[PDB]
Amino acid sequence: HAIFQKVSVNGADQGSLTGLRAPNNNNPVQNVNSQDMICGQSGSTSNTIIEVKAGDRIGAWYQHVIGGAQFPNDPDNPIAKSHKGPVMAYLAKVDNAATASKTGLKWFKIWEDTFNPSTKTWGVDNLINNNGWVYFNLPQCIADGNYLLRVEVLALQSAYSQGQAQFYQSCAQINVSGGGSFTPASTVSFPGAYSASDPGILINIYGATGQPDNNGQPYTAPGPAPISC
Template sequence: MKLVRQLSLLSVLSLATIKGFAHYTLPDLIVNGTVTADWQYVRETANHYSNGPVTDVTSDAIRCYELDSTSAGAAGIATVAAGSTVGFRSNIALYHPGYLSAYMSPASPAANSNSAGLGKTWFKIWEAKPAYSSSTGMTFPTENEQEFTFTIPKSTPTGQYLLRGEQIALHVASTVDGAQFYIGCAQLNVVNGGSGKPGPLVSFPGAYSPTDPGILINIYTLPAGYAGYQAREYSRRILRYRKSFTTRAIAGPAVWSG
């Protein structure tokens, strides 16, 4: 009986250890419903074995989390039309609570160049916001999904780009450098584009601060301003605050929709 208890305890500890380290990567590009092979168009990331996240938003790893200087040349360049549905598939479900964003950056001279994505060139094209209610607290509609997709704006100019998919996991984000960033950068050749002027433009690193409201946050505690909230109170002030909170709980610039 003692041996059985010890084995059961070891099993529980083993499962806890596995879950603790079972983070994820974003190795697969999705184009119009088709999932491509691992790292076929996505630059291989430094966590391709460990699955570990980036936690320092001031490091160069926050850009594309590349394995090394060979990642860009090893990945191909996928040709997609402006207006196409694209996205990423993770190696396991995105089980951490957090939100998703997608950015693009023009790539010159080519998407597989190591200089692509440097400087203030990135613009956000999509985000999946958290939701909030008094009964559930903050929730994340994309939690436990393995794929996320979005549209390249139809007015995106023709050319080569980096497409950066990201989940910011917030389960331990109540202290500085607690938020976890899971990142993948795919290399694209966008055709049949338009004459839009993407913006606002940001850089990586530079787009985020360790103390941004959407990065330094305790998602398990009611935000300031809800302390006296009662279920029967639906004043305009409270409804405005709820809307603004879920908006400012997203890091980075506004979405450019074209």
């Protein structure tokens, strides 16, 4: 249970919920056929469009509830340690990131932090060690203009049962300058890109001792692979 609720650009804090389409509550989306999969449950909206440069180092901030910890010494801030899984980030080009409908957009993945088997480290583990932040660079080659930037935590502690993977998603509204001429060879739809039977979604991550180490095996995230310039 957590909410992506703040963006940084080269370390510059854009402010709580600035530029975000974020859910009001921290409950997961679990039906991958749902429209809630695109930017999370419909919640807050923003008129701001965050100015970024292609190549910029983006930070996305998760906390347990809107505003941070739910109470002093919250064990589950930024997210509960049990919620092992990958973090993924996608872009969709839009004409106007403040007014574009989220329905039927053309998405492509730019970054993911999944699972390192020899260090036994999930993307959510790095999110936790980074105090809620995940960091990635926008590709240098993407074209100028508005985009929706969707960041997604997939928590797998219950994903051994059908439809019980948990997704925590929000979208950020950005405008890119200094870009290039890249166009993706292939895009995906949300909902639609993920199936409940995907090996990264219907999965038992529990090893012999009962620890969520995926039995030391490599993990395959759902969705397309990150693009490369």
